[PDB]
Structure formats: structure tokens, C-alpha cells
Design a protein around this ligand. Structure first.
Ligand SMILES: O=S(=O)(O)C[C@@H](O)CNC1CCCCC1
Ligand SMILES: [Mg+2]
Ligand SMILES: [Mg+2]
Length: 536
């Protein structure tokens, strides 16, 4: 049996994360001061007689600084009051910010708040083109539209053209903030990534910065960073101990990248168990994916697929030695999950993730069959298989495992492929297909998404890619609509799904394949989030 020649780049990081011993003195000192700062900030939030603009700016700043997770109740109360008071006497900057904050928190504020800034045709008044803070906040708001907000159809184009025009002559750090926003909007960014940028590059350099908030943000970020490093060390040791790097050498060695993805799903300390469980799943399914894509024979993949469906250690017999390796590891991992959720009485929920993994593997095999037969399915058939091979139904399901408040009812909701989940999955599917078309086409994958699209509609590669981009935009509008109250499950269980979509936008930014090539997109984020602390 002739195996393919391995072509995955080695891990970028070596052993540098393998060992992290926390400085307890420093961590304790940080936590003590943060408690004081937190109380000071709580009082800023609860101050009476603040103007609307000031209140919104404060909330926005605390959110961008990445410390809003300390104040979920205070912020929710304040935003609810603003929503219900329904004010109208504002300028563009305040109106756009108000719209964005409320929509992001699920308050369905009417887009009619923008009508006073438009002519008779719903086009934004170009007389506003010299209002940079207005344009910036309009730009950010334009990304949180639903299908009911066609009033705002012009907002992105309008704000973009005039921010571009103004940017080179703007004062710092406003120039840098505008330039950054044009590359990466806030709503679609990974929260810890945007927080790292905002604290260090913008807020630290604002003449009018509040020193209490800045110090709070820096200490909180660096203290949470200590937790993250501890987690990654624990996961790095778990990975090293499995030693796939040598027993399964055809496979990617990307546990640090998997950790970054888990960190994007949630960064808060209370999701520590959830993060570690999630990264282990992302690592393990990555192995499976590599086995289907670039090592296993048709015969081997069949047995593997069947073995996964039956989920029984007695099935190791039918597998080739190398396949035995990952199959036992997978079965052990889920046993570990069950064990880990035992003392909480939440062991029984692990079955939901297992069923989703079975689904992923079934569709990996279908994908293999298509490749082997040279089949190019219609788009509808393509998606019926290829949506699950994003692993995103599986990852969202996994993300709930370590969340202590997640109930069977939450898993029931998720199992029905609700709209917001389907949207996130679609975004991952079409953005990856656009970014990876040319390489996959080179390797003879005639059932890649864009190829299926081209043949089905009889259109060019350019036209197919535009169609796929449209599908992503529709999906983002569906995500935004899915956050609106009343929500079908607690918002806590929607945010991971939102964050999976954000991970897509960030990993494939500028249509780069940051998936297959870690150095291309992800390496600087990992350094900024997990190697370098923020200087105080
Ligand atoms: O190439 S596949 O379609 O098999 C898988 C790919 O689409 C998705 N892989 C990662 C998952 C987590 C980070 C974002 C993308
Ligand atoms: Mg694959
Ligand atoms: Mg691809």
C-alpha cells in the first residue's frame, strides 16, 4: 500500500507552551486590585443623571476593553431602559452606537432611527460625509443588520467610502481605529483579538482615556491570559502524551491553533472546563479529517466509518493498526468527558456530541466516495453533505459540554438544527470553499463547493464565488436575527454559535486560507493572546 507523501508544515511553536507555572503572588495581587477597580467601574455604570451619549460611550468602552463580562446585569438593565425609553433626538454617532449596542444585546430597536439621516430614497445624506465619528459608528452598526433592515442597505458602502477618504489625515489613535475597522469590523471579530487590539493600540493612546478603566482592562486581560496559558499547557501535555506526532505522522500537529479556536468560542474564566474539553475535540476530529483526506484507502475509511457508527471498543479488531490508534483515543476521550462530568450529574449529555461526531464521520466518507467516483453533485446535494463536514454542528454541540448551566433542553434545541446554528455552519462552509477552491481544484477535488456551484448554475468561478459570498451575507443576517429577544434558549448558548461564525471571518480574513496555513493568519493572534502580555 502506497501512502501519500506528508505535506503538512510542522508545528510553529515547539515546546514553548508545554510548561507554564503561574506566579501566584502576581496573580493574587492582580485579583485584589481588580476587585477594587471592578467596584469602581460598577459605580461608574450605576451613576445617576448621565446623558444618553455618555452612557452609551461608557458601555461601548467597557465592552471593547473586554471587561464587560463582569457587568452583564448592569449593562443589560441600562440597555433595556434605553430601549424602552425609545429616544430619537440624536446625532448620527449616538444613534448608530445606540442601534448597534441594542441589537447586539438582542433588543430589536427599529432601523427607523436612521431615517432622519437619509433622503427620500433611503440614501444616507452625503452632507454627513464629514462626520468621522458618525461614519465610524454607522460602519460598525451596518454589520448587525437582519433581513428586516433594508433601510440600512446603503450604510456599509456609504460609511466605507468616506472613512477611506478621511483616514489618512486623521489624528491618532482615531486613524488607527478607523483603518483597523475597515479591515475588521467589531461585530464579526474574535472578542479577545479585538480587545487586545483596542486596549494596546487605541485606548492606551487616547488623550481622554479613563485611567481606572485602562488599568482594569490591562490587569484583567493579563490575569485571564495566565489562566489561558495554564489551560494550553495542560492541553499541550495531553497532546504530547498521545504522541500522534510520531505514531500518526501524516496528521497535522496543530493543538495551539485548536486552542486559539476554543478561546474564540469563549474566553471567560468560568468556561475553563468547557474550553479544555472543546480543544480536545477539535484536535481529535482534525486527526480523523486528515485520515480521510490524505492517508486512508477507500476500504480503510469504510471500516473506520462503520466502527465510528457502532461506537464499541470491541470493534478495534476490524481496523488497521494505525486506525486503532485514533479509534481508541476517541473512545477514551469521551469516557474521560463522562468521568469529568460525573460529580455534576451531567454525564448523560455526552451522547449528543457523540451523535454529532458520528454525523461528521458519515459525511467524511460520503465526501471520499464522491472524490473517488469523480462525482460533481448539484449544490443542494453538495450542501446536504458538506455542511456537516465543516464540523460546526459538532463543535457547537461540544461547546455546551463544559457549560455547567447547559440542560438537556438546550441540547434538544440544538439537535434540531435551529436557524442560527445552520447560519454559522453555512458561513464556515462557503467562506472555506471560496478560500480553498484553487488548491482543492489542483488536487482534483471535483466536488468542491465552487465547482458544484459552477456546474450547477453554469456560471464562472468569479460568479460562483459571488453567489457564495451572498450566502454568507444572508447567513450573517440570520445570525443577527437569531440573537433577538425573546431567544429560544438563554443567550449564553447562542454566543458560542455567534463566536464560531466570528472564528470563520477571522481565520479566512481577506480570503486567505488561515485554516491550512497557521503562519498566514493565526500566528500573530496567538502571540498577542497567548505569548506577550500587555505592557502596563
Ligand atoms: O475543510 S473542511 O471543510 O473539511 C473543514 C473546514 O471547512 C473547517 N475547519 C475549521 C474548523 C474550525 C476553524 C474554522 C474552520
Ligand atoms: Mg478534509
Ligand atoms: Mg476547503
Amino acid at each position: 500500500i502506497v501512502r501519500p507523501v506528508a505535506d503538512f508544515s510542522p508545528s510553529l511553536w515547539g515546546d514553548q507552551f508545554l510548561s507554564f507555572s503561574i506566579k501566584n503572588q502576581v496573580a493574587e495581587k492582580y485579583a485584589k486590585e481588580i476587585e477594587a477597580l471592578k467596584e469602581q467601574t460598577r459605580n461608574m455604570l450605576l451613576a445617576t443623571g448621565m446623558k444618553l451619549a455618555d452612557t452609551l460611550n461608557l458601555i461601548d468602552t467597557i465592552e471593547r476593553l473586554g471587561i464587560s463580562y463582569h457587568f452583564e446585569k448592569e449593562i443589560d438593565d441600562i440597555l433595556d431602559q434605553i430601549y424602552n425609553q425609545n429616544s430619537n433626538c440624536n446625532d448620527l454617532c449616538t444613534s448608530a452606537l445606540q442601534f448597534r449596542l441594542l441589537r447586539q444585546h438582542g433588543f430589536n430597536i427599529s432601523p427607523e432611527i436612521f431615517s432622519k439621516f437619509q433622503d427620500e430614497n433611503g440614501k444616507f445624506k452625503e452632507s454627513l460625509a464629514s462626520d468621522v465619528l458618525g461614519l465610524l459608528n454607522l460602519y460598525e452598526a451596518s454589520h448587525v443588520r437582519t433581513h428586516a433592515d433594508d433601510i440600512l442597505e446603503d450604510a456599509l458602502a456609504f460609511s466605507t467610502i468616506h472613512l477611506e477618504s478621511a483616514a489618512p489625515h486623521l489624528k491618532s489613535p482615531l486613524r488607527e481605529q478607523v483603518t483597523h475597522a475597515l479591515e475588521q469590523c467589531l461585530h464579526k471579530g474574535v472578542p479577545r483579538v479585538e480587545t487586545r487590539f483596542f486596549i494596546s493600540s487605541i485606548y492606551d493612546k487616547e488623550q481622554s482615556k479613563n485611567n481606572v478603566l485602562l488599568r482594569f482592562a490591562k490587569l484583567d486581560f493579563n490575569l485571564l491570559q495566565m489562566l489561558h496559558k495554564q489551560e494550553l499547557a495542560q492541553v499541550s501535555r495531553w497532546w504530547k502524551d498521545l504522541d500522534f506526532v510520531t505514531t500518526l505522522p501524516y496528521a497535522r500537529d496543530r493543538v495551539v491553533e485548536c486552542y486559539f479556536w476554543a478561546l474564540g468560542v469563549y474566553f471567560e474564566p468560568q468556561y475553563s472546563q468547557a474550553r479544555v474539553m472543546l480543544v480536545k475535540t477539535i484536535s481529535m476530529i482534525s486527526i480523523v479529517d486528515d485520515t480521510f483526506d490524505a492517508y486512508g484507502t477507500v476500504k480503510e475509511l469504510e471500516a473506520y466509518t462503520d466502527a465510528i457508527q457502532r461506537w464499541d471498543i470491541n470493534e478495534i479488531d476490524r481496523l488497521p493498526d494505525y486506525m486503532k490508534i485514533s479509534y481508541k483515543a476517541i473512545l477514551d476521550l469521551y469516557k474521560d468527558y463522562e468521568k469529568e462530568l460525573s460529580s455534576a450529574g451531567r454525564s448523560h449529555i455526552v451522547c449528543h456530541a457523540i451523535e454529532r461526531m458520528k454525523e461528521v464521520v458519515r459525511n467524511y466518507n460520503v465526501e471520499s466516495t464522491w472524490f473517488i467516483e469523480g462525482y460533481t453533485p448539484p449544490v443542494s446535494e453538495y450542501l446536504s453533505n458538506a455542511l456537516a463536514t465543516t464540523t460546526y454542528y459538532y463543535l457547537a454541540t461540544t461547546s455546551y459540554l463544559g457549560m455547567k448551566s447547559a440542560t438537556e433542553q438546550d441540547f434538544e434545541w440544538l439537535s434540531k438544527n435551529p436557524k442560527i446554528l445552520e447560519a454559522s455552519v453555512i458561513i464556515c462552509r462557503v467562506i472555506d470553499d471560496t478560500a480553498t477552491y484553487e488548491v482543492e481544484k489542483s488536487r482534483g477535488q471535483i466536488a468542491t463547493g465552487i465547482e458544484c456551484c459552477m456546474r450547477d448554475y453554469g456560471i464562472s468561478t468569479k460568479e460562483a464565488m459571488a453567489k457564495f459570498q451572498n450566502m454568507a451575507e444572508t447567513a450573517w443576517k440570520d445570525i443577527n436575527e437569531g440573537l433577538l429577544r425573546p431567544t429560544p434558549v438563554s443567550t449564553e448558548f447562542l454566543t458560542p454559535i455567534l463566536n464560531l461564525a466570528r472564528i470563520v471571518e477571522v481565520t479566512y480574513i481577506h480570503n486567505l486560507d488561515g485554516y491550512t496555513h497557521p503562519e498566514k493568519v493565526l500566528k500573530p493572534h496567538i502571540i498577542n493572546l497567548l505569548v506577550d502580555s500587555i505592557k502596563i
